[PDB]
């Protein structure tokens, strides 16, 4: 929510249910994948991603 936080780049959310334990990752536009493990680390990392 922040102090008015919003998209600075287009943002691609891909969602698929699976019986396997929760996992999220991300992709930077310099052809770098990153492992986020459980999706608690998502919210901050996807703002941090856009910034760079």
């Amino acid at each position: 929510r922040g102090s008015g936080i919003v998209t600075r780049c287009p943002l691609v959310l891909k969602l698929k249910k699976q019986p396997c334990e929760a996992w999220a990752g991300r992709i930077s536009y310099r052809n770098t994948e990153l492992e986020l493990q459980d999706p608690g680390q998502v919210e901050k990392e996807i703002h941090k991603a856009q910034n760079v």
């Binding site: 396997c20 334990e21 996992w23 493990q37 459980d38």
Partner: peptide, 11 residues
């Protein structure tokens, strides 16, 4: 040890 190495194991 981590979820990282347990995923490689499952795959």
């Amino acid at each position: 040890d981590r979820g990282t190495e347990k995923s490689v194991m499952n795959v």
